[PDB]
């Protein structure tokens, strides 16, 4: 009746699709934003420090505001892209307070 020797079970999601349940993922998403937050922590204020970024194409780009710093760093994580979207939205609407 069967076509062959054995029949391996189907994975519901595609092979290699990452997924997780519980409170661990939302903590990882929050910790991902805090990891991006720590880069812009000492930049805030008049006595703050600039950030030097060098992308894969080897073009130097120094900046103080968080609008173009986040544009240079191509963000993979969706939760960390939330800070990048509001920074460009704040840069597009007002133009101040992108780090705060």
């Amino acid at each position: 009746m069967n076509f062959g020797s054995q029949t391996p079970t189907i994975v519901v999601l595609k092979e290699g699709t990452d997924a997780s349940q519980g409170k661990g993922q939302i903590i990882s998403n929050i910790n991902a934003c805090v990891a991006v937050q720590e880069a812009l922590k000492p930049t805030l204020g008049p006595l703050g420090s600039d950030i030097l970024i060098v992308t894969s194409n080897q073009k130097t780009t120094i900046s103080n505001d968080g609008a173009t710093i986040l544009k240079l760093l191509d963000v993979v994580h969706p939760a960390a892209k939330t800070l990048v979207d509001i920074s460009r939205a704040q840069d597009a609407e007002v133009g101040d307070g992108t780090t705060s």
Binding site: M1, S5, Q6, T7, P8
Partner: protein, 538 residues
């Protein structure tokens, strides 16, 4: 259910497990189908080593070719276990389980349960056991009919070898079996009858020797070759050196004391040789006419062989365990181990002892006994496979004829047993039986499966198997009304029925009994199994 548990596994269930047991059964049946019968085909088996061994026995085919299927290994143990104790009926077990599965599988496809089908085989098997009591015939052993034993010996030997080997090897078995029967009526096959290999002129020159033959002879030239009257002596004591449990150095001090202590090696050996000389002094009369021979189970030192050579005493060393258990039966003497207590009563008797050598090996022949209680069958052969073919033929022939003397009954063969059970199971009233429900086809399945064996004999001859049973069926229809009890047969020479009572075709009693019992158990267990799987740590 098994794939999420085990990451790697194989599983067949509810249709493939049934097809596997039937397909593997039909596959293994086709291998041994052509070998069954007298006109069957031979089968050689050559491994990577290059040796050759030729025989028609299904056990040799199964226990030499490695097999991977899980069904056939149970048929291999079943065919082997039935033959290992009985010595006959190997392919018959494979054909029954090979045919009973396919004959029941057609009704499993119809939708009948396997449980009630196997219930029909068991209650049908009990009817065959009741039929064996009425079908067998009593035979009294007090008559000592040698012609009856000759016909039984030709039943198995004609199947394995041709008529040229059967006619010359048949009375070799009959003379060996004629001495088995005695007043005690205790059968003894392994100790009494033996087989020994010897590359010689041809297979046709096999002869019977009433005494025990040995595969060794006299080492020294001056020791006598032929002895007329040789009184044997059994001694299991080892007459070479012994290392002596931790005993160490013969600490010698001076040079003269060195060889003085080396001479003590002979004193332990000479202490035992003197007892043999004291025994020879009692039987010293007629020393040129008579003789003396010593047979040891362990090795003899070459220093002591010159002692026996001077007194013209024949020496034989390193005998088997079985030969020491046979010298008392042949020569009539008694066994001895220690050299302290000797007597002339334990010495045997022999009428002729001579040696013949070929190439490097040398054989010692003993025969012309007064009242030999045992004997041997020295088989001659050309090639190694010729000895292996004669090994299986003599091994299966002695066990088949020996079982006739165990009981007081014998079963005629040539399909008479299977054809008789066919009419019995198909004509018996079912109300007498306790089986009801869907046991209608189980009686017909097992009754019809027995018919395939006697036509497999016809399939090797090339005739039409269905047409040569027409007159067989017509004979039994008139035989019951004619008031004449006769048993038909299947003669493959002319393609017509025959009578095994006058032709001499016979079969043992426990072969067909154990065959159906072993086959019904294996075939029933394979039918009830509905799932196959492999799992374990490796």
């Amino acid at each position: 259910s098994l794939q999420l548990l085990n990451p790697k596994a194989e599983s067949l269930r509810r249709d493939a497990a049934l097809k596997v047991n039937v397909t593997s059964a039909e596959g293994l049946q086709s291998v041994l189908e052509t070998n069954l019968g007298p006109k069957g085909t031979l089968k050689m088996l050559v491994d990577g080593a290059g040796n050759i061994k030729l025989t028609k026995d299904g056990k040799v085919l199964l226990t030499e070719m490695q097999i991977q299927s899980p069904t056939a290994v149970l048929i291999a143990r079943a065919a082997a276990a039935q033959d290992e104790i009985t010595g006959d009926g190997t392919t018959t077990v494979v054909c029954l389980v090979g045919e009973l599965l396919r004959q029941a599988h057609r009704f499993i496809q119809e939708g009948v349960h396997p449980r009630i089908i196997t219930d029909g085989f068991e209650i049908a098997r009990k009817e065959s056991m009741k039929f064996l009591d009425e079908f067998k015939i009593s035979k009294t052993n007090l008559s000592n009919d040698r012609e009856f034993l000759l016909q039984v010996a030709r039943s198995s030997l004609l199947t394995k070898v041709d008529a040229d080997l059967t006619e010359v090897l048949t009375p070799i078995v009959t003379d060996a079996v004629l001495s088995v029967y005695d007043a005690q009526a205790d059968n003894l096959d392994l100790h009494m009858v033996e087989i020994m290999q010897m590359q010689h002129l041809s297979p046709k020159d096999t002869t019977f020797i009433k005494g025990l033959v040995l595969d060794h002879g006299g080492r020294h030239p001056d020791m006598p070759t032929r002895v007329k009257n040789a009184y044997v002596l059994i001694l299991n004591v080892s007459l070479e050196y012994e290392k002596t449990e931790v005993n160490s150095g013969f600490f010698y001090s001076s040079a003269d004391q060195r060889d003085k202590l080396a001479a003590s090696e002979r004193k332990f050996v000479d202490a035992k040789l003197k007892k043999i000389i004291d025994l020879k002094n009692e039987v010293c009369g007629m020393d040129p006419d008579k003789g003396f021979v010593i047979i040891n189970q362990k090795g003899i030192d070459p220093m002591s062989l010159d002692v026996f050579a001077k007194h013209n005493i024949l020496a034989l060393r390193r005998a088997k365990r079985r030969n020491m258990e046979r010298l008392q039966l042949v020569t009539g003497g008694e066994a001895q181990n220690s050299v302290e207590d000797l007597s002339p009563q334990i010495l045997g008797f022999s009428g002729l002892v001579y040696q013949e050598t070929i190439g490097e090996e040398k054989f010692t022949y003993v025969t012309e006994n007064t009242d030999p209680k045992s004997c041997t069958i020295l088989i001659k052969g050309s090639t190694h496979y010729a000895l292996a073919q004669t090994k299986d033929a003599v091994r299966d022939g002695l066990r088949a004829v020996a079982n006739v003397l165990k009981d007081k009954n014998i079963i005629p063969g040539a399909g008479a047993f299977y054809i008789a059970l066919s009419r019995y199971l198909r004509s018996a009233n079912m109300n007498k039986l306790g089986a009801k429900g869907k046991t209608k086809t189980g009686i017909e399945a097992f009754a019809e499966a027995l018919l395939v064996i006697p036509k497999t004999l016809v399939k090797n001859s090339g005739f039409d198997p269905l047409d040569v049973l027409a007159m067989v069926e017509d004979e039994l229809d008139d035989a019951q009304d004619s008031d004449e009890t006769r048993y038909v047969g299947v003669d493959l020479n002319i393609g017509d029925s025959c009578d095994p009572t006058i032709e001499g075709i016979w079969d043992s009693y426990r072969v067909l009994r154990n065959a159906i019992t072993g086959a019904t158990g294996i075939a029933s267990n394979l039918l009830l199994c509905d799932e196959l799987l492999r799992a374990g740590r490796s």
